[PDB]
């Protein structure tokens, strides 16, 4: 669903960037942050797609996949993220196993919902 | 989806119990716990339904809706939950606003997923 879209984009865009952002504070506006980040990526590449997760004690934890055909300027990722964030950026290799493991990792706090 | 099911059960079962369970430790088997709890509720009332959420630092946090036509023996809820859990049990009144606010509260850590 999200995953079918993630697989489709992973294997149709040159670059799939997996960005993890952590802060040690919770103040700030994750809507505004993600929106303005998405707008930056949109201006970078109008065909790009962005998949984002906010994980919800002390700080924020965001995971972002950026699918794009133009290499990212990593310094701008930081400029469009909260001040003093801990940021890691990885290029996800074009393998099914790798993108699925990344997806699984991103959604790990979003599961464990069961109706019987 | 889950919510349409939750509304349907809320307004077709006499009792809707909203149970919150917290522990200060992470060891233990949330699959086995939830399964055995579900089995206890099934034996209590074979028509019952159970909606469960595990929220994922120091401990476990579970939210459970139990829909049933037979009053729960609250002491058994504790017997089928981890030792020394902090447990709260509420009967959710038969109002749309109340059940929706409970649902929203249960899913609050499971949102913030966005694809553009």
Tab-separated table of C-alpha atoms in Angstrom:
chain	number	residue	atom	x	y	z
A	1	UNK	CA	0.000	0.000	0.000
A	2	UNK	CA	2.466	2.508	1.267
A	3	UNK	CA	4.922	-0.366	0.693
A	4	UNK	CA	3.816	-1.012	-2.894
A	5	UNK	CA	4.317	2.718	-3.537
A	6	UNK	CA	7.705	2.633	-1.770
A	7	UNK	CA	8.836	-0.292	-3.950
A	8	UNK	CA	7.603	1.340	-7.127
A	9	UNK	CA	9.394	4.617	-6.396
A	10	UNK	CA	12.536	2.868	-5.153
A	11	UNK	CA	12.962	1.143	-8.501
A	12	UNK	CA	11.928	4.080	-10.732
A	13	UNK	CA	13.972	6.895	-9.144
A	14	UNK	CA	17.747	7.075	-9.367
A	15	UNK	CA	18.212	8.037	-5.721
A	16	UNK	CA	16.425	6.739	-2.626
A	17	UNK	CA	17.677	8.546	0.481
A	18	UNK	CA	16.854	7.177	3.938
A	19	UNK	CA	17.179	10.011	6.435
A	20	UNK	CA	16.873	9.585	10.180
A	21	UNK	CA	16.567	12.693	12.347
A	22	UNK	CA	16.662	12.746	16.137
A	23	UNK	CA	16.434	15.652	18.554
A	24	UNK	CA	16.674	15.837	22.327
A	25	UNK	CA	13.689	18.201	22.558
A	26	UNK	CA	9.975	17.981	21.716
A	27	UNK	CA	9.135	21.662	21.174
A	28	UNK	CA	8.622	22.600	17.539
A	29	UNK	CA	6.115	21.929	14.814
A	30	UNK	CA	6.491	18.602	13.022
A	31	UNK	CA	3.783	19.615	10.529
A	32	UNK	CA	5.608	22.802	9.525
A	33	UNK	CA	8.976	20.994	9.496
A	34	UNK	CA	7.819	18.150	7.271
A	35	UNK	CA	5.829	20.492	5.004
A	36	UNK	CA	8.723	22.899	4.496
A	37	UNK	CA	11.090	19.971	4.003
A	38	UNK	CA	8.716	18.515	1.405
A	39	UNK	CA	8.559	21.903	-0.321
A	40	UNK	CA	12.369	22.116	-0.440
A	41	UNK	CA	12.507	18.610	-1.992
A	42	UNK	CA	9.721	19.560	-4.418
A	43	UNK	CA	11.747	22.606	-5.525
A	44	UNK	CA	14.844	20.338	-5.788
A	45	UNK	CA	12.963	17.901	-8.071
A	46	UNK	CA	9.301	18.406	-9.024
A	47	UNK	CA	8.921	14.628	-9.692
A	48	UNK	CA	10.221	13.644	-6.249
A	49	UNK	CA	8.313	11.713	-3.588
A	50	UNK	CA	8.744	11.832	0.167
A	51	UNK	CA	7.624	9.231	2.680
A	52	UNK	CA	7.787	10.331	6.310
A	53	UNK	CA	7.260	8.861	9.764
A	54	UNK	CA	7.214	10.642	13.131
A	55	UNK	CA	7.856	8.183	15.976
A	56	UNK	CA	6.295	9.139	19.307
A	57	UNK	CA	10.082	10.588	25.445
A	58	UNK	CA	12.847	13.236	25.539
A	59	UNK	CA	12.952	14.202	21.846
A	60	UNK	CA	11.753	13.801	18.279
A	61	UNK	CA	12.474	10.868	16.005
A	62	UNK	CA	11.752	11.185	12.263
A	63	UNK	CA	12.428	8.769	9.403
A	64	UNK	CA	12.190	9.990	5.842
A	65	UNK	CA	12.525	8.355	2.425
A	66	UNK	CA	13.218	10.756	-0.415
A	67	UNK	CA	12.883	9.421	-3.966
A	68	UNK	CA	14.525	11.735	-6.490
A	69	UNK	CA	16.410	11.762	-9.790
A	70	UNK	CA	18.769	14.514	-8.659
A	71	UNK	CA	21.446	14.114	-5.992
A	72	UNK	CA	20.591	15.832	-2.734
A	73	UNK	CA	22.770	18.578	-1.292
A	74	UNK	CA	23.056	17.104	2.201
A	75	UNK	CA	23.801	20.498	3.853
A	76	UNK	CA	20.302	21.646	2.827
A	77	UNK	CA	18.716	18.617	4.483
A	78	UNK	CA	20.174	19.961	7.738
A	79	UNK	CA	19.066	23.542	7.003
A	80	UNK	CA	15.490	22.260	6.594
A	81	UNK	CA	15.547	20.207	9.792
A	82	UNK	CA	15.390	21.287	13.448
A	83	UNK	CA	18.471	23.004	14.810
A	84	UNK	CA	21.022	20.656	16.406
A	85	UNK	CA	19.284	17.536	15.069
A	86	UNK	CA	21.285	14.339	14.853
A	87	UNK	CA	20.913	13.418	11.193
A	88	UNK	CA	22.008	10.350	9.258
A	89	UNK	CA	21.613	10.027	5.505
A	90	UNK	CA	22.002	6.762	3.582
A	91	UNK	CA	21.503	5.902	-0.052
A	92	UNK	CA	19.381	2.794	-0.089
A	93	UNK	CA	20.777	0.300	-2.606
A	94	UNK	CA	18.491	-0.949	-5.387
A	95	UNK	CA	17.664	-4.277	-3.775
A	96	UNK	CA	14.223	-5.485	-2.675
A	97	UNK	CA	15.608	-6.798	0.600
A	98	UNK	CA	17.231	-3.484	1.472
A	99	UNK	CA	14.222	-1.248	0.790
A	100	UNK	CA	11.860	-3.663	2.562
A	101	UNK	CA	14.135	-3.794	5.614
A	102	UNK	CA	14.216	0.020	5.647
A	103	UNK	CA	10.415	0.218	5.333
A	104	UNK	CA	9.987	-2.354	8.102
A	105	UNK	CA	12.318	-0.341	10.325
A	106	UNK	CA	10.437	2.887	9.641
A	107	UNK	CA	7.054	1.338	10.494
A	108	UNK	CA	8.176	-0.638	13.557
A	109	UNK	CA	6.436	1.674	16.077
A	110	UNK	CA	3.274	1.825	13.921
A	111	UNK	CA	2.218	-1.833	14.087
A	112	UNK	CA	0.845	-3.983	16.921
A	113	UNK	CA	-2.751	-3.082	16.112
A	114	UNK	CA	-5.048	-6.132	16.272
A	115	UNK	CA	-8.808	-6.643	16.144
A	116	UNK	CA	-10.354	-9.988	16.990
B	1	UNK	CA	-11.980	0.527	9.112
B	2	UNK	CA	-10.831	-0.515	12.513
B	3	UNK	CA	-12.899	2.516	13.589
B	4	UNK	CA	-16.030	1.444	11.704
B	5	UNK	CA	-15.695	-1.947	13.425
B	6	UNK	CA	-15.103	-0.248	16.798
B	7	UNK	CA	-18.262	1.855	16.361
B	8	UNK	CA	-20.330	-1.116	15.276
B	9	UNK	CA	-19.251	-3.229	18.250
B	10	UNK	CA	-19.540	-0.324	20.690
B	11	UNK	CA	-23.213	0.085	19.846
B	12	UNK	CA	-24.103	-3.632	19.592
B	13	UNK	CA	-22.449	-4.948	22.779
B	14	UNK	CA	-23.710	-4.108	26.249
B	15	UNK	CA	-20.246	-3.478	27.677
B	16	UNK	CA	-17.270	-1.698	26.117
B	17	UNK	CA	-14.287	-1.789	28.478
B	18	UNK	CA	-11.284	0.463	27.836
B	19	UNK	CA	-8.291	-1.025	29.624
B	20	UNK	CA	-4.907	0.648	29.852
B	21	UNK	CA	-1.951	-1.386	31.107
B	22	UNK	CA	1.493	-0.004	31.888
B	23	UNK	CA	4.596	-1.745	33.183
B	24	UNK	CA	8.019	-0.445	34.141
B	25	UNK	CA	9.783	-3.303	32.333
B	26	UNK	CA	10.043	-4.484	28.715
B	27	UNK	CA	10.850	-8.178	29.214
B	28	UNK	CA	7.953	-10.498	28.447
B	29	UNK	CA	6.013	-11.630	25.428
B	30	UNK	CA	3.316	-9.244	24.222
B	31	UNK	CA	2.127	-11.836	21.684
B	32	UNK	CA	1.588	-14.502	24.348
B	33	UNK	CA	0.055	-11.950	26.746
B	34	UNK	CA	-2.449	-10.590	24.245
B	35	UNK	CA	-3.262	-14.068	22.893
B	36	UNK	CA	-3.886	-15.555	26.332
B	37	UNK	CA	-5.869	-12.472	27.321
B	38	UNK	CA	-7.958	-12.825	24.156
B	39	UNK	CA	-8.516	-16.502	24.958
B	40	UNK	CA	-9.683	-15.644	28.491
B	41	UNK	CA	-12.142	-13.079	27.045
B	42	UNK	CA	-13.265	-15.613	24.424
B	43	UNK	CA	-13.998	-18.135	27.201
B	44	UNK	CA	-15.796	-15.341	29.140
B	45	UNK	CA	-18.023	-14.569	26.118
B	46	UNK	CA	-17.673	-16.416	22.796
B	47	UNK	CA	-19.252	-13.432	20.934
B	48	UNK	CA	-16.775	-10.918	22.367
B	49	UNK	CA	-14.341	-8.773	20.386
B	50	UNK	CA	-11.009	-7.367	21.490
B	51	UNK	CA	-9.132	-4.459	19.954
B	52	UNK	CA	-5.554	-4.043	21.154
B	53	UNK	CA	-2.671	-1.618	20.744
B	54	UNK	CA	0.923	-1.960	21.958
B	55	UNK	CA	2.626	1.449	22.141
B	56	UNK	CA	6.395	1.388	21.661
B	57	UNK	CA	11.296	3.460	26.742
B	58	UNK	CA	11.328	1.947	30.259
B	59	UNK	CA	8.206	-0.242	30.056
B	60	UNK	CA	5.189	-1.550	28.181
B	61	UNK	CA	2.064	0.408	27.350
B	62	UNK	CA	-1.045	-1.462	26.143
B	63	UNK	CA	-4.544	-0.190	25.359
B	64	UNK	CA	-7.372	-2.654	24.960
B	65	UNK	CA	-11.055	-2.376	24.055
B	66	UNK	CA	-13.162	-5.350	25.070
B	67	UNK	CA	-16.684	-5.579	23.640
B	68	UNK	CA	-18.806	-8.087	25.544
B	69	UNK	CA	-22.361	-8.791	26.687
B	70	UNK	CA	-21.235	-10.130	30.057
B	71	UNK	CA	-19.703	-8.025	32.824
B	72	UNK	CA	-15.989	-8.584	33.258
B	73	UNK	CA	-14.528	-9.854	36.518
B	74	UNK	CA	-11.848	-7.178	36.854
B	75	UNK	CA	-9.588	-9.354	39.081
B	76	UNK	CA	-9.167	-11.749	36.132
B	77	UNK	CA	-8.058	-8.914	33.861
B	78	UNK	CA	-5.134	-8.481	36.265
B	79	UNK	CA	-4.453	-12.236	36.448
B	80	UNK	CA	-4.143	-12.277	32.640
B	81	UNK	CA	-1.831	-9.264	32.501
B	82	UNK	CA	1.859	-8.912	33.407
B	83	UNK	CA	2.688	-9.045	37.093
B	84	UNK	CA	2.722	-5.648	38.836
B	85	UNK	CA	1.120	-3.882	35.859
B	86	UNK	CA	-0.580	-0.564	36.464
B	87	UNK	CA	-4.073	-1.209	35.134
B	88	UNK	CA	-7.037	1.101	34.655
B	89	UNK	CA	-10.437	-0.113	33.508
B	90	UNK	CA	-13.239	2.173	32.315
B	91	UNK	CA	-16.653	1.447	30.896
B	92	UNK	CA	-16.954	3.573	27.805
B	93	UNK	CA	-20.374	5.247	27.709
B	94	UNK	CA	-22.596	4.669	24.668
B	95	UNK	CA	-21.836	7.969	22.970
B	96	UNK	CA	-20.167	8.459	19.580
B	97	UNK	CA	-17.963	11.226	20.941
B	98	UNK	CA	-16.696	9.084	23.801
B	99	UNK	CA	-15.794	5.994	21.762
B	100	UNK	CA	-14.175	8.108	19.030
B	101	UNK	CA	-12.098	10.003	21.599
B	102	UNK	CA	-11.000	6.667	23.088
B	103	UNK	CA	-10.113	5.288	19.639
B	104	UNK	CA	-8.198	8.462	18.790
B	105	UNK	CA	-6.279	8.172	22.055
B	106	UNK	CA	-5.426	4.528	21.411
B	107	UNK	CA	-4.098	5.244	17.905
B	108	UNK	CA	-2.200	8.443	18.741
B	109	UNK	CA	1.272	6.833	18.457
B	110	UNK	CA	0.277	4.997	15.246
B	111	UNK	CA	-0.309	7.989	12.960
B	112	UNK	CA	2.064	10.545	11.417
B	113	UNK	CA	2.640	8.420	8.326
B	114	UNK	CA	2.588	10.517	5.133
B	115	UNK	CA	3.429	9.845	1.492
B	116	UNK	CA	3.697	12.673	-1.004
